[PDB]
C-alpha cells in the first residue's frame, strides 16, 4: 500500500459574500467509488466534516455546500458565501489508506475597514525584570495588507520586532495585528520617543501612535 | 451526543515515548472504526492509523513500525503510543470516529472511513528544553483618551515554553471584542503572545478588567488586573 497524494487548488481564495466558491482537489491516482470527504477547519478547533461520499452532506451542513467529481478530479462548491465560511477547507480520500489535501484558505471579502491603532508602553512590572516590551495593536482592519513601522527617536527599526495576525473574524471579516518591539532596560532608557506608524489603504495617511519614555 | 475526550503528555524530549488516550462517550466501540490523526505545519493533516473492536489495526505505511494503537473495548477508550519520538513528530494529535460498521453474511465491514466527531486535540512538542511559566504583564490603557469612544487594553503573556496557553477575560464574562493573537517564538526559544480587548472608554473608571492566563505545562495560573495608566 502507498499514499495517494491530494493536491488542492487554489491555495487561497478571496471572494465577496453571495459569490460562489469552487475548490479543487486532484488525486495522484484514481479514488475508488465515491470515497472522498471534505472538511472545514477554524482556528483552535479540529476539522469539521462537511461532505462525505463525494456528494453526501453531514448533519447540519446547508444545501449551499455541494461536492462532486470522480476518479482524480473532485470539487467542493459553496454558493451564497457568508462571512462564517471564512476558513480552511481540506479534502480527504479513503479509497486507500486515508490521506488529506494541503487545504484551501477561503477569505471572505468585506468593505474597507481602517485599523484602530493603539500603542502600549512597557509596564513597571516588566521594567523591574530588566526588559522592556513595546506593543502596537492594529484592531479590526480589512484588507489584510498593512505596514507597521517602529520608530525610536525617529530611527526606523528593522529586524527588531515580531508580529502576529489573527485569522479572519468569522463575524465581521476583519483582521487584527499585534507587533512587539522588545529591548533591554538599558537600551530602552537610552531613548525618549517610541512610535508606531501604521499604513493601510483604509487610512487617508499613515497614522502614528507614540509616547515619550519617562515623562509620566 | 457522541463525544470524544482525549488527554496525554504533550511535551517530551527526543527519543522519548509518546502516549495519548481517547475516551469515547455515547457510542459503542464495535459500531465504528477509531483513528488517530495529527496535524503539523510542515506536513499538514496526517492519518496515523486505525483500530476496531476486534483489535485489528491499519497503519499509515510511511509511519508503520514507529507506533502501536490499542483499544479498551470495556472502558470505551483507545490509545496511541509512539515508541521513540523525533523532532518531526511535533504536531496537534487528534482522535476521531472513523468508518461505520456494515453487517454482511458471516462478516462485518466498514464504509465511509471519514472522521466525525473529533477529539479536542493534544499539542505535542518534542524538545529537550525545560518547561517555563510565563510572566503576565498588563497592556494598560491610558486614563486620558486613546481614541475618544473606544479604548484598548490587554495582557502580555511573555517568556513561556512550551505551547499552549489559554487566556480569558473576567472569567469568561467578557468575550466581545477580545483578540488573542498567535504566539511568536522569540530568539531565546521562549514563546510570547498578547491578548487584547477593545472596550468603551467611559468604562475605564468603573469596570474591572482581569485577564485569566493559564499555562498548564508549568501549572502557572495568573489572574492579572489591568489598570489605566495615569500621569
Ligand atoms: C449522551 O447523550 C445523551 C443523549 O442522547 C440520548 O441518549 C443516549 C444514551 C443514546 O440513547 C442516544 O441515542 C440518545 O439520543 C445525554 O443524556 C441526556 O441528557 C439530557 C440532559 O442534558 C437529559 O435531559 C434531561 O431530562 C431530565 C428529565 O426530563 C423529564 O422531565 C422533563 C420535564 O418535565 C420531560 O419533558 C421529560 O420528558 C422527562 O420526563 C430533565 O429534568 C433535565 O432538565 C434534562 O432536560 C436526557 O434525558 C438524557 N438522555 C438520556 C437518554 O439519558 C448524555 O448527557 C450524553 N452523555 C455524554 C457524556 O455526552
Ligand atoms: C476538474 O473539474 C473542474 C470542475 O469540476 C473542471 O473545471 C476542470 O477542467 C477539471 N479538470 C480535469 C483535469 O478534468
Numbering used by the authors:
A (entry chain A): -1 to 27, 27A, 28 to 94, 96 to 214
B (entry chain B): 1 to 82, 82A, 82B, 82C, 83 to 100, 100A, 100B, 100C, ...
Recite the paper's sentences.
The PCDN family is a lineage of antibodies isolated from an individual participant in the International AIDS Vaccine Initiative’s (IAVI) Protocol C, a longitudinal study of neutralization breadth in HIV-infected individuals. The donor in question, PC76, developed a broad serum response targeting the N332-glycan supersite (also known as the high-mannose patch), one of the key epitopes on Env, which involves N-linked glycans and amino-acid residues around the base of the hypervariable region 3 (V3) loop. All thirteen of these antibodies have a cysteine (Cys) residue at position 100 k, which is located at the base of CDRH3.
The crystal structure of PCDN-38B also showed evidence for cysteinylation. The cystine of this antibody, however, displays weaker electron density than observed in PCDN-16B that may partially result from multiple alternate conformations exhibited by the cysteine adduct here. Based on the electron density that was observed in the omit map, we determined the cystine conformation with highest occupancy, and modeled it into the crystal structure. Optimum definition of the refined electron density was found at around 60% occupancy of the adduct, but we decided not to model any other alternate conformations due to low confidence in their positions. For the most occupied cystine conformation in PCDN-38B, the disulfide bond formed to Cys100k adopts a very similar conformation to the cystine of PCDN-16B as shown by the dihedral angles between atoms Cα—Cβ—S—S’, where S’ represents the sulfur of the adduct. However, the dihedral angles over the S’—Cβ’—Cα’—N’ atoms (all on the cysteine adduct) indicate an overall rotation of the acetamido group by approximately 57° in the two structures. In addition to electron density corresponding to the cysteine adduct, we also see some ordered density for both expected N-linked glycans in Fab 38B. In the PCDN-38B crystal structure, the difference between B-values of the adduct and protein atoms is considerably larger (70 and 41 Å2, respectively); however, the average B-value of the N-linked glycans is 75 Å2, which is similar to that of the cysteine adduct. As such, we cannot say whether the crystal structure represents the 52,927-Da major peak, the 52,888-Da population (the putative cysteinylated version of the 52,770-Da peak), or some other species.
